[PDB]
Design a protein around this ligand. Structure first.
Ligand SMILES: *[C@@H]1O[C@H](CO[C@H]2O[C@@H](C)[C@@H](O)[C@@H](O)[C@@H]2O)[C@@H](O[C@@H]2O[C@H](CO)[C@@H](O[C@@H]3O[C@H](CO[C@H]4O[C@H](CO)[C@@H](O)[C@H](O)[C@@H]4O[C@@H]4O[C@H](CO)[C@@H](O[C@@H]5O[C@H](CO)[C@H](O)[C@H](O)[C@H]5O)[C@H](O)[C@H]4NC(C)=O)[C@@H](O)[C@H](O[C@H]4O[C@H](CO)[C@@H](O)[C@H](O)[C@@H]4O)[C@@H]3O)[C@H](O)[C@H]2NC(C)=O)[C@H](O)[C@H]1NC(C)=O
Ligand SMILES: *[C@H]1O[C@H](CO[C@H]2O[C@@H](C)[C@@H](O)[C@@H](O)[C@@H]2O)[C@@H](O[C@@H]2O[C@H](CO)[C@@H](O[C@@H]3O[C@H](CO[C@@H]4O[C@H](CO)[C@@H](O)[C@H](O)[C@@H]4O[C@@H]4O[C@H](CO)[C@@H](O[C@@H]5O[C@H](CO)[C@H](O)[C@H](O)[C@H]5O)[C@H](O)[C@H]4NC(C)=O)[C@@H](O)[C@H](O[C@H]4O[C@H](CO)[C@@H](O)[C@H](O)[C@@H]4O)[C@@H]3O)[C@H](O)[C@H]2NC(C)=O)[C@H](O)[C@H]1NC(C)=O
Lengths: 206, 207
C-alpha cells in the first residue's frame, strides 16, 4: 500500500489559461479493504476538504485510487508545500507525502535555433534544432510551429543538469528537406517561469 | 532479500581490448542466513559454473553479496540472455533475473556537428553541438576532442526514443568563444555497435 505524489506540468503552472493539478496516486490497495481516505494540506492548512476529486481503478489484482487537487498557479510558483495524507484501515499509520517546486533562484532559459548541418542535406527529411540552455528550475515546455500552425514530428530531450547548476536540452523538429528548402519559417516556443510572459519564441529559416 | 542485474558499459562490449561483465548484486541479506548461492545461465545454459566470481561486504545491518560474470563482446552484442539465479535459505523461491542487449535490428547512427548559433556569440563561452540520430539499440557513448586531446566541459543527453523507433541525442561541448574563434578544430567521437569499427568521428570548425 503506497502513495505517490506528482507535481503539475511546468506548462500548466505557467499559463493561467490552463489548470495545474497535483495528483496523489495510491498503489497496492487490496480488495480486503479498498476504502482509501485522502486529506490535503496546502502549506499546513486545509484539513477540511476544498477542491479534491478521486475515482476507482482496478489493476493486476490490487488497486490504484487517485485523488486530484487543483492548484493555484502562483501558489505552486511561490513554493507552497502541498501535502497528501492517505488513510487505509490496512495501514497502521496514514501515509503523508509532500510536494513543492524545486528551491532556488530561477534562471531565464537562453533559447537558440540550429539549422540542418550541411551533411544532413543528403536526406529527404532534415532536423531543425532548438537549444534551450541555462534554465532553473527544470520545469519547462517546448513546442514548434510553422506559419502560426503546430508541428507534430519533433521530440525533446528531458532536461539535463549542466556544469553551473542550470539545465539544458534540445528539441528536434524533423521536416521534409523541401519545406526547409522552400524557405519556410519555423519557430520554437519555450515556456518557463523565469521568462517574461512565461513564453519566448525563436524563428528558424534558410 | 533482493537481486539486481547490471549490464556492462557500452564501451566495454565495443572494444575487444576491454573486459565487459554483467553484475548480480544482492541486497537485504540478513546475518541469520548470509549463505548466498549464485547460478549463471547464458541463453538458458550453463547451470554448472564457468567464469564467475563473488565476495562478501557488510552494510547498514544487512549484507551485499556481489557476483560478477565476464561476457564475450559478441555474445552480448548478439543479444544473448544472461540469467542470474540467486539462492538463499531465508528465501522460499530462488531469485531469477535476466539481462541482455535490447531486442530489435541494429541501426547505424548519423553523426552531425552543429556550430554555435549567431545569437550565442554574444557570450564568453559557446556551445558546439553533436547530434547523434537514428541509432538502435540505445547503448552508446560520445566524447569530444580538439587536437587529439580530450575535452571535459561537455554534457550528453540520455538517448531519446524517436518516431521511427530509433533513438537520438545531443552532446554539448562548451568552449571559450576565443578558442572557437581562433579557428580551433574539435571532434565528437561516437561509439556504437552498428558503426564500422564501432566508432566514427565528426569535426567542427569555423572559417
Ligand atoms: C541497507 O543498505 C543497503 C545498501 O547500503 C547502501 O546505502 C547507503 C545509503 C549507505 O548507507 C551505504 O551503506 C550503501 O551505499 C540498501 O540497499 C539498497 O536497496 C535498494 C532497494 O531497496 C537498491 O536500489 C536499487 O538501486 C539500483 C541502482 O543501483 C546502482 O546504483 C547505486 C547508486 O545509484 C549504486 O550504489 C549501486 O551499486 C548500483 O550501481 C551500479 O552497480 C553495478 C554493479 O556494481 C555497476 O556495474 C558496472 O558493470 C560494468 C560491466 O561492464 C563494469 O563492471 C562497471 O565497473 C560496473 O560498475 C554500475 O556501474 C553501478 N552504477 C553506478 C550507480 O555507478 C536501481 O537501478 C534500482 O531501481 C530499479 O528497481 C526499482 C525497485 O527496486 C524500480 O523502481 C526501478 O524502476 C528500477 O527498476 C533500485 O533503486 C540499492 O541499490 C541498494 N543500495 C545500494 C547503493 O547498493 C538497503 O535497502 C538497506 N536496508 C534496507 C532498509 O532495506
Ligand atoms: C500491480 O499494480 C501496479 C501495476 O503497475 C504496472 O505494472 C504491472 C504490474 C501492470 O500489471 C499494470 O498494473 C501497470 O502497468 C503495481 O504498482 C506499481 O508500484 C510501483 C511501486 O510500488 C509504482 O512505482 C512508482 O512509479 C513512479 C512513477 O509514476 C508512474 O509512472 C508509470 C510509468 O512511468 C505510470 O504508469 C504511473 O501512472 C505513474 O505515472 C505518473 O502518474 C501520475 C499520476 O497521474 C501523473 O501525474 C501527472 O500530474 C500532472 C499534474 O498537473 C497532470 O495531472 C498529468 O495529467 C498527470 O499525468 C504523471 O504524469 C505520470 N508520469 C508520467 C510518465 O507521465 C515513480 O516516480 C516512483 O519512484 C520512486 O519510488 C521508487 C521505489 O518504488 C524509488 O526507487 C525511486 O527512486 C522513487 O523514489 C515509483 O517507482 C508504480 O507506479 C505502480 N504502478 C502504477 C503504474 O500505478 C503493483 O505493484 C502491482 N502489484 C503488486 C506486486 O503490488
Amino acid at each position: 500500500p503506497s502513495v505517490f505524489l506528482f507535481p503539475p506540468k511546468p506548462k500548466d503552472t505557467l499559463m493561467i489559461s490552463r489548470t495545474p493539478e497535483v495528483t496523489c496516486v495510491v498503489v497496492d490497495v487490496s480488495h480486503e479493504d479498498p476504502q482509501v481516505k485522502f486529506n490535503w494540506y496546502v502549506d499546513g492548512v486545509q484539513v477540511h476538504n476544498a477542491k479534491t476529486k478521486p475515482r476507482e481503478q482496478q489493476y493486476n489484482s490490487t488497486y490504484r485510487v487517485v485523488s486530484v487537487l487543483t492548484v493555484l498557479h502562483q501558489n505552486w510558483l511561490d513554493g507552497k508545500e502541498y501535502k497528501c495524507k492517505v488513510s487505509n484501515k490496512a495501514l497502521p499509520a496514514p501515509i503523508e507525502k509532500t510536494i513543492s517546486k524545486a528551491k532556488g533562484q530561477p534562471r531565464e532559459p537562453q533559447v537558440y535555433t540550429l539549422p540542418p548541418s550541411r551533411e544532413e542535406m543528403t536526406k529527404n527529411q532534415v532536423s531543425l534544432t532548438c537549444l534551450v540552455k541555462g534554465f532553473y528550475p527544470s520545469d519547462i515546455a517546448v513546442e514548434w510551429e510553422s506559419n502560426g500552425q503546430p508541428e507534430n514530428n519533433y521530440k525533446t530531450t528531458p532536461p539535463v543538469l549542466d556544469s553551473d547548476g542550470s539545465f539544458f536540452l534540445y528539441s528536434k523538429l524533423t521536416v521534409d528537406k523541401s519545406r526547409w528548402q522552400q524557405g519556410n519559417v519555423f519557430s520554437c516556443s519555450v515556456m518557463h517561469e523565469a521568462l517574461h510572459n512565461h513564453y519566448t519564441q525563436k524563428s528558424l529559416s534558410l
